[PDB]
Amino acid sequence: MVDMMDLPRSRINAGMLAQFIDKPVCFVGRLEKIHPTGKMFILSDGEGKNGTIELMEPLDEEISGIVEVVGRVTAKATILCTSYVQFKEDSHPFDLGLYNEAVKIIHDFPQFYP
Amino acid sequence: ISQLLSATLVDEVFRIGNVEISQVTIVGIIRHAEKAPTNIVYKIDDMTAAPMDVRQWVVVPPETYVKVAGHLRSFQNKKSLVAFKIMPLEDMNEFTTHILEVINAHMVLSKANS
Amino acid sequence: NWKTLYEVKSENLGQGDKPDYFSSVATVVYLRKENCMYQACPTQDCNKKVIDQQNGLYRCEKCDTEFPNFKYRMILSVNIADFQENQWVTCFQESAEAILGQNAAYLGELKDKNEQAFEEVFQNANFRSFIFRVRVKVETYNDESRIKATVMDVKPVDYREYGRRLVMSIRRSALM
């Protein structure tokens, strides 16, 4: 076993979850809902699709908006989150459609983006 | 950071692929930092390889995105960066633009050398 | 009109007999810290650098008058670099005050009152990115022909449209 923090974490959207099972991934989305026990939530990407986030301990911090999480793709087409961070949008909005287009670009020609 | 650690060292000037580089800039998230009487070292992570090291001579708190520009160094065959300046992002679209800037830059020169 | 410094230097720009204008985005690398400010005439317009009379009074040759006060002004030479090339350009008060994020008089006071802060201004302004509108023309001096570049406008960057243009160029260019 090796720590996932020191691996090439990929960046993807909700729609690609079916082809990256068990590998580390990086997910960007806007918060949608929180399971009432504070142990699950769901994010959405530019296309509007959704992916679920699972955790290990209850969350004592309220989180909303664009969310940044990293984890391992489980067998249920889900993300087993290890860490999360939330951007700052206090002065500008995040053009999430532009980021989705950029992410679509990376996997089109990975030679220039190893 | 994925392509920096893969750079060759010849006659004091580092090369990547078919292009030379001496001054570079990247964007990532701080992971940890320590204080020294003469300089500071940050572990900048951009989620495509292990946290690189950047050194600045005489502090941004952790988990913050930043943009850096500096020089590439090798010491005991270990890659590192010496940074002229480090600036936290304010608009979060900067790194989304940077992701496309990188693919444009490291793709335009390739055909020129062809 | 979108241009790249490499194409500017390699597509026959500025070599003509007329001042050509172009706009591009690039990062500021170096700022000339000395020989930037020259005392100027209190009148509203004069294409003349005042001359000192060494008695608390100044004279202007173009208008042939004398006043007891002078106005500071800015001429800045700066190097702009991109992912493929670099270029030298010169900035007057309008663009210089934008890039330095200060007015001419305040910087003039600072240089003669606080030199460390004067340097820090250039330091902070260094490595920033702006959208540059520049014009280039050939000037003949002592029988040498060379291109001089002057900055028209300085503004911050449009990240969204910049990314849209980049992605459109990438998709279009590759598929050719």
Numbering used by the authors:
A (entry chain C): 1 to 114
B (entry chain B): 51 to 108, 119 to 174
C (entry chain A): 441 to 616
Paper text:
Central to these functions, RAD52 promotes the annealing of complementary single-stranded DNA (ssDNA)8,9 and provides an alternative to BRCA2/RAD51-dependent homologous recombination repair. Instead, cryo-electron microscopy and biochemical analyses revealed that ssDNA annealing is driven by RAD52 open rings in association with replication protein-A (RPA). RPA associates with RAD52 at the site of ring opening with critical interactions occurring between the RPA-interacting domain of RAD52 and the winged helix domain of RPA2. Our studies provide structural snapshots throughout the annealing process and define the molecular mechanism of ssDNA annealing by the RAD52–RPA complex.
